[PDB]
Amino acid sequence: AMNLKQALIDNNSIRLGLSADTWQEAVRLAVQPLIDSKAVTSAYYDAIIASTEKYGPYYVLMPGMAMPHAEALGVNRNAFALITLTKPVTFSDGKEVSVLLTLAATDPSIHTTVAIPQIVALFELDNAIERLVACQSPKEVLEMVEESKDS
């Protein structure tokens, strides 16, 4: 089980400065890099849209970030993806998002025991979302992620 930096490399999962008009557009874009790496199937995007439709945007945990995921489904392999938006997108609860960290798992208890702690740490860094938005290559995204693992 899973290291965020490594997962991101193994999947080549980082996308930088994409553009979306709806939170549906942004979720699609956020899951794409995981369909690209064959970690998940489109049916995973569908499952995110569907769980958002019944539960509301539950994975939007801190200002400026979503970690899109469903209770899974279209998943072959544990993976993370990381995308960065040009302009903040507004989710159906009124929250504004500029960074989506997609999470996929074949076991549901990974989410809180393993994944959220890592995600939490990246975003608990001094000026993270804007730093992340101004990242000019996956290299520095990954450098931010190493910085997360310590202190």
Catalytic residues: 69
No. of H helices and E strands in the chain?
7, 6
- To which H or E segment does residue 2 belong? none
Question: Which SS3 state, helix, strand or coil, does residue 142 take?
Answer: helix
Pair of tokens at residue 57: 């945007």
User: SS3 helix, strand, coil % of the chain, rounded to 5?
Assistant: 45, 20, 35
Helix (H) / strand (E) element for 88: namely strand 82-90
103-104/79-80 β-pairing: antiparallel
Beta carbons of 114 and 42 less than 8 angstroms apart: no
